[PDB]
Amino acid sequence: MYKLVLIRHGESTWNKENRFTGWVDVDLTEQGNREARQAGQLLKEAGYTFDIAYTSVLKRAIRTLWHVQDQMDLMYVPVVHSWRLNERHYGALSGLNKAETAAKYGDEQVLVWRRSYDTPPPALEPGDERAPYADPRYAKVPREQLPLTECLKDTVARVLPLWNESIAPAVKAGKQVLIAAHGNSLRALIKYLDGISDADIVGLNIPNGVPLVYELDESLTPIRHYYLG
Amino acid sequence: MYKLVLIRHGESTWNKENRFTGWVDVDLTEQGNREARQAGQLLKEAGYTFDIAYTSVLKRAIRTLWHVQDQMDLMYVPVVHSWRLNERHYGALSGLNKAETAAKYGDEQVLVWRRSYDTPPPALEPGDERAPYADPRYAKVPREQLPLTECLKDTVARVLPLWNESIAPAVKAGKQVLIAAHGNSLRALIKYLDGISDADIVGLNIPNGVPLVYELDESLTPIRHYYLGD
Ligand SMILES: O=C(O)[C@@H](COP(=O)(O)O)OP(=O)(O)O
After folding, report:
1. Which CATH code, of 3.40.190.10, 2.170.130.30, 3.40.50.1240, 3.30.565.10, is assigned to B1-230?
2. B110 CA to centre of ligand 1 in angstroms
3. Closest CA to B162 of B148, B183, B141, B147
4. Is A9 annotated as a binding residue?
């Protein structure tokens, strides 16, 4: 029996502005901060603890983690910040208002761009300011592994090495893990963990700032899962 | 040539209350939060960046780091939190007001507790609430290595292994390192770095929340150091 807690970052600015975010490094709203703080308080009160946490390199997730740590009195635990946990990359949609985009390209198109397992949004041009190449966060990521766009499928491919190489061993080592990540990177990981089919994942949505608890057996096969609070 | 930036945590509740803190895990005051923020801005404006940061397991140091990372847009960097960077353990003095303590045991006595390199304050009882043993922060540290009190000499000895095993290799590795820690634990590191005598370390005081830049030669020998700011 292992427990693993997932939590999606609190409400970000672009969440609130209903803008596609992906790799753009936007921060938490005040509400996002509340949610993160409330999640940490929830975890504290339910008596949960952590020996390690995993996060992306995007401040909305890390700041959420911070608030969780702050509330749980766990600011001292090792935190692994991984670009592998990054939100799904939204290519040339990053920054665009979702309502405006669906008005322009149709809801269907947008729904494909948002939830197609295998078909990514349109890509960033390699020369877009928003491309990841010159970002210090990715300085050690081999260029050809940095996306200009992603579908969930890419996200799953990107997350898995972090799971296999780091999180799973941490869990089996008996470390109590928190993963603070993103809507679609958590969908990606959860797709893997729950062995969810390509069609079945399409409808999964994870609210901001709600601890999602996984109980895992000795082979790390999910037993059940549940949100806290 | 390398640069290493050191910063003592911003003002803490017990800094303001003039209380020996030690391993008591008190938080930053609002002033302390602002010092931490300002130090970040100052480093950001100076064009400083970091690849890795080292800190203690004490939130006053860690929150300072957070504010720095926040202001510098480096919330994603690896942070090693090590008990080895903890503030010097203050023993049975922890939580006591320094002024009343002086008023009771004498200025000399207090100053020997506070700045004598080799004489520790009086120890915590092993049964004291404040003893470290049940603390998850220290769960993997051998009991015998956990202090009930420390003089600076203990602090040095406690710090050096992190320096040798980890921070020095980072610096040699070409990593740009920030260490966010405490007055005495930095006094201890600096003693080693600058090769300050037992007598001389006595006067060294390190202000809250001010970046202290060391420029190190190839052999990690300080060439110069300066505070950033005023
Ligand atoms: O232990 C403490 O009270 C102070 C040092 O106090 P003095 O020994 O300098 O009085 O440490 P910090 O606030 O930097 O963590």
Report:
1. 3.40.50.1240
2. 13
3. B141
4. yes
